[PDB]
Amino acid sequence: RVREYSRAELVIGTLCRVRVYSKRPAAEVHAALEEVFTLLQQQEMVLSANRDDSALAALNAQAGSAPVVVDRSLYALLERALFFAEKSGGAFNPALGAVVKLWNIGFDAVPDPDALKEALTRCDFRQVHLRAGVSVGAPHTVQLAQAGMQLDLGAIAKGFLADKIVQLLTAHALDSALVDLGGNIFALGLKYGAQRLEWNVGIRDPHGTGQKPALVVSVRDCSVVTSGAYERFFERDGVRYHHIIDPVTGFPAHTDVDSVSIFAPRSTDADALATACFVLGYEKSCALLREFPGVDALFIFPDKRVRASAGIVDRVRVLDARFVLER
Ligand SMILES: Nc1ncnc2c1ncn2[C@@H]1O[C@H](COP(=O)(O)OP(=O)(O)O)[C@@H](O)[C@H]1O
Ligand SMILES: [Mg+2]
Ligand SMILES: [Mg+2]
């Protein structure tokens, strides 16, 4: 008997839901889901920026001092984040904490011009030194060379966690699932109905209440992560300030797309690239994405035109006829 299971909780500061189809005994699926959400709870205390408690916060507290020992997994995440910092030319920047914290208070007024200029001197991700010994049991260490520099993994954390969850589900012999971490999707395998079908993931209207999808894409074994100008913002004197920062200016990025969705085998990659591509804009995004052949992208423009890379365009269906899919 094929059974369908779902579970959701408020965790890592958002609503996380996993949906599973399985013929394994219910007890086994329940065990897997129990562990998925235990993982998420534990990982919140490792990765969460703005905590005091988290490993990340402790790491930030040691900026400008001695190397700090970290678990293999946090290390691996940092390696990847720096990787995308280099490839994207800093558009995605995991060492942007000093600036983000200044805007984080705004949500609760615009930062001061110089204060902002000052924070940016403390965002050189190239000053993040990762070192790992090669001998049996050698430790993994991180050193923030520049004083005042603060790590913030908010733009790659969900992807990292979705990949961890997929590993977990797979470890429990589950091969059909839809992982949703606050809009960060991973579609594992196929769902059940033509019997076995691709998952249908909706992309919201960037200006929409998010109750209905503008588009829907069919995918298997794939992450779908969207970066929008309206996922999170505050308004002051007629001006909207969204959460995604352009590290050159220190202000919310001004770009020629309303949203960019990345489709990748790894959600970690999809999450970082989605953020980078938003900051870069359409043309520079296309250039960067050519260096990642196994990745696909979907851009929604302010005039409601939609462009999709060759890998997914055939799998895209428009639900809101105000939008047009260019071929
Ligand atoms: N240019 C950037 N590079 C990396 N991280 C960023 C950047 N700008 C903002 N951030 C951090 O990442 C978060 C946004 O990441 P993103 O993945 O685009 O959105 P979401 O949080 O919805 O996944 C912000 O809340 C901020 O803390
Ligand atoms: Mg991101
Ligand atoms: Mg993200």
CATH code, domain carrying 133: 3.10.520.10
Q: Which structural domain, as residue segments, surrounds residue 257?
A: 1-327
Beta pairing class for 233-236 and 239-242: antiparallel
Cβ atoms of residues 165 and 36 within 8 Å: yes
Ligand 1 closest atom vs CA 279: 1
d(CA 327, CA 322): 16
* Identity of the residue numbered 297: A
Resolution in A: 2.3
Contact 177, 223 (CB under 8 A): no
As a whole number of angstroms, the longest Cα–Cα distance in the chain is 64
Residue type, 188: L
Separation CA 158–CA 163 (nearest Å)? 9
Owner of token pair 């052949």: 293
Count of CB atoms situated within 10 Å of the CB of 183: 16
Q: By the 8 A CB rule, do 271 and 244 touch?
A: no
Ligand nearest to the CA of 269: 2
Cα torsion 269, 271, 272, 275: sign: positive
Ligand 1 binding residues, C-beta < 6 A:
92-94, 96, 100, 152, 154-155, 158, 227, 231, 243-245, 247, 271, 275, 279
Q: How far is CA 166 from CA 30, 137, 178, 183, 266, in A?
A: 15, 27, 9, 16, 10
Q: What are phi and psi of 284, to 5 degrees?
A: -70, -30
CA distances from 121 to 82, 148, 241, 245, 327 (A): 17, 9, 22, 15, 43
In angstroms, the CA 306 to CA 315 distance is 13
CA distances from 261 to 164, 245, 298 (A): 21, 17, 5
Between vectors from CA 255 to CA 249 and to CA 258, what angle results, nearest 5°?
135
Q: Are strands 213-219 and 251-252 parallel, antiparallel or unpaired?
A: unpaired
Q: Which helix (H) or strand (E) element contains residue 81? A: helix 72-87
Q: Which ligand is nearest to the CA of 152?
A: 1
Q: Which two tokens stand for residue 244?
A: 């995604």
Edge-to-edge strands of the sheet including 68-70?
A: 68-70, 140-144, 128-132
Quote the number of domains for the chain: 1
